[PDB]
C-alpha cells in the first residue's frame, strides 16, 4: 500500500512559478534507499527527467532546467514538492512523481527501477 | 534527451514474438542499467523490467529484457490484446547527468477484429 | 579406468553459479559417445573442438565446471559474452577449448513456493577474469559514503536468489550447466577418448 | 582463513596393517582436499586429489574419502616405503592451507641402541675446539635419552643431537649426540661419558673414555 | 613435461633483500596463474603468494604481506618474488608452482625442484673434516664441522661402502655454522686390511675433502 498522491494547479500563468505536491501515503517518505524524482511528459511526446532528491535534502537536476527547478521534501507533511519558475508554453506536460531505488534497504528490492508512480497532474502553461 | 532511440511502432500477430530494441551509447546503456516501463493510454508508466533483465512480481513472464553493448531489447513472447501500450527504455547517462528515456514504442497486436 | 562423468551430470545437488564447482577429470578413458547421442541436453556447444571427433583426441587433463542458472542465461556461458553471469559469476576466456552442456532442470530445482537455495552475484566493482571464482559476501559500495557491513543508500548486497517456480516460462526456469574444458600441455596425456 | 586439523600427529603400524588418518576442516570445503606424501629431504608428492582420486602412478594401496568438513586418508596395506609425513591441503579458498601432518612409523620389535663414544680428533684439538660424539646405532622405538657427564657433573646447554630417518630395511633409527667444549675446558677434566637410557635396555648404558689413552 | 627451474637462492643477511626467479617451460605460461610456496627447516608447507594470468591481481599471506612482492614477465616466461627485509623465519626452500587456467588460483598442478634461501649473518665457509676413529663390530665416522650454508654430501670409499652408512642431518650451532656427522659400522676383522675414506662435498664453497679414518 505504497501510494503517491499528486496535487497542483492545472493552469499556470507564464513567467510565474509552478508548484506541485506529491504526498506519500501508506508508509514514510524517508525510509528506504530511494531517489525521489520528478518526471514530466508533453502530451504525445516522450518522458523527460526533471531531477531528484535523496538523503536529507541534497538534489541533482537536469542541466537544461537546473536553474529554474526546485525540489523539496516536507517530512512532517510527508510530501515532496516541485517548483518551476518562469514557465513558458514549452513547460506544458503531464507531471509525475515516482521513487527510484538505489540501495539494499528498498522494499521490494527493485534496484535502479522507478518503483511506484503518481497518477500524474496535467499542467497547461497559458495566460488564457 | 533523444540518446536512447526506439522504433516508434512495432506490430505483430497474436501469439507471436516481438522485439523492441533500444539503441544508445556507452555513456548510458554501455555503462549503466537499463529499465523498461509500460504505459497504457491515460495512465502512468509501470515498471516492467528493472536492472537489464530482472522481472518484478506481477508482470507476466512473457516479458524479458536483454542487454549487449550499447543496446537493450525488450521481448514479449506471445503477443496478446492486453499488451497494447507504449514501452520506454530508461538509463542514466553519465555525460548528461540525467535519466534518459527513449521515444517509446507503441505495440499494436495485429489480429484484432 | 573409465571416466566418472556420471558423478558430474547425475549429481544429486548442484551449486550456485557464484560458487560454481570444478571437478578434475584425470587418468581415465573418457567416453563422450553417450553425451553425443543423449537427447537430454538443450545446449551442447563446443568451442575449439568437435564433439564427433572427440573419441580420438587425448588430453593431459579435463575439468568439469557445474552450476545452475536460468534459461535466458545459458547463452552467456560462452567466450565473448556479457551479462550478470558472464561478468560477475562465470567467465570463459576467448581462447576457451571445450564444450558447454546444459539441460532444463525444472522438475528438480523448482519448488511450488519457489526454490531460493540457488544464488547469483548481482553487483561487483569489476568484471571477473576468465575462470575466476568470487564467493565473498561483502557489502557492495556503489557510491561516495562507505558501507559498514549494513545495506543502505548506495549499499547493496552482492548475492541474489532465483525464483524458480514450476509455472515460470522456459526462459526463467532453472538450467543445469556442465562446462567441460580441456587442457593440453607438453606433457603425457592421461585422459583419452574411446 | 580455513584451518585443517590432522589426527593423529604421528602413528606407528606393522607392515600390512591398515592405516587411516583424518583431516577435519574448520568449514565446508566441498571436496577440495589434497593429500601429499613427503619423505625427508624430498619435496611433497601429491597422492590424492579432489578428496577421492588417485594421482598418476600412485599405487592402489592409497585411497581417500570425505566431503565437507571431515576427510580421511587410508593405506590399506602399509609398506616400508610408506615412511613419510602425510599432509592434507585444502584449495577451497585463499590462502591455501595445509594440515599439521601425520608422521608414519613402522612397528618393529624393540631393539636396543649400540652405543659408541668418540674422542675429539687430535687435528681438531689443534684448532682450539673439542667435540665429543656419542652414537646410538640401530634402535627402536625412536624415543631415546642421552645425558653427558664431565667429571661426574651432568651437562646441559652444551650439546646438540640429531636423528636419522627410519631405515626402510630394518625399521630402526640412529641418533648422534655431540658435546662441544672449548679446548681449555676439555683439558681441565678427565672423565667424559654419555649415558643412554632406552626401552630396549633394562638399565642405562654408559660409554666413557679417559682423556689421554 | 612442465619444467620449473628456480634460481636466485642463497645467503642473505637480515634486513636485506633477495629476488627469486622461476623459469617455466612446456606450457603457455602467459595464460596460467603462478604460485610461490616455501617450507622452513623442520616445518610444514606454507603458501606464500599467487598471481593471475596478466599480473594484475596478486594475493599474499599475512606472514609476508607488505614485505614480499610477486611479479611476472610473460615475454621472458619467468616468475619473480621480490623478498624485502628478510627475517630468519624466511629461511626455507621456496618452490614455484603452476596454478589454474587463468584466475583459478586454486590449483598447484606442478611444483619446481625448489631453491633454498638462507637468512643469516654468516659467510660462506667450507667444512672442517675430522675423523671419528674406531665388540664384534666397530663404528667409525667423519665429523663435518663449521660450514655454511647447507648442504653437504658425504659418501664412503667413493661410493663402494654403502651398507651400514648413517649420515645424520645437520644441526645449526649458536655460531651460525652447521655441524654434521656420517658414521659407518664395519666388522673389526677388516679394520687393518681395508682403508675407509669419507668423501665430503660442499658445493656452495666448492670444497671437496677426502678424509682417511684410521685407528689409534
Ligand atoms: C540516486 O542519487 C544519487 C545521488 O545523485 C546517486 O549516487 C551517485 O551514484 C553515482 C553512480 O552510481 C556515484 O558515482 C560513482 O561513485 C564512485 C566514487 O567513489 C570514489 O571514492 C571512494 C571512496 O570515497 C572510492 O572507494 C572509489 O573507488 C576507489 O576504488 C576503486 C576500486 O577499489 C578504484 O577503481 C577507484 O579509482 C578508487 O581508487 C572512488 O574513488 C566511483 O567509483 C564511480 O566510478 C566512476 O569513476 C571511475 C574511475 O574511478 C570510472 O571509470 C567510472 O566509469 C565512473 O565514472 C562513480 O564516480 C556517486 O558517487 C553517487 N553519489 C552520491 C552522492 O550518492 C545514485 O546513483 C542515484 N541512484 C539512482 C538509481 O538514480
Ligand atoms: C546418468 O544416468 C543416465 C541414466 O538415467 C545414464 O544414461 C548416463 O550415462 C549417466 N551419466 C553419465 C555421464 O554416464
Author numbering:
A (entry chain H): 1 to 128
B (entry chain L): 1 to 113
C (entry chain R): 334 to 527
D (entry chain B): 1 to 213
E (entry chain A): 1 to 134, 141 to 222
Quote the study's own text.
S from both SARS-CoV-2 and SARS-CoV-1 uses angiotensin-converting enzyme 2 (ACE2) as the cell surface receptor (Hoffmann et al., 2020, Li, 2015), ACE2 is expressed in a number of tissues, including epithelial cells of the upper and lower respiratory tracts. S consists of two subunits, S1 that mediates receptor binding and S2 responsible for viral and host cell membrane fusion (Walls et al., 2020; Wrapp et al., 2020). The S1 fragment, at the membrane distal tip of S, includes an N-terminal domain (NTD) and receptor binding domain (RBD). Although both regions are immunogenic, the RBD contains the interacting surface for ACE2 binding (Lan et al., 2020).
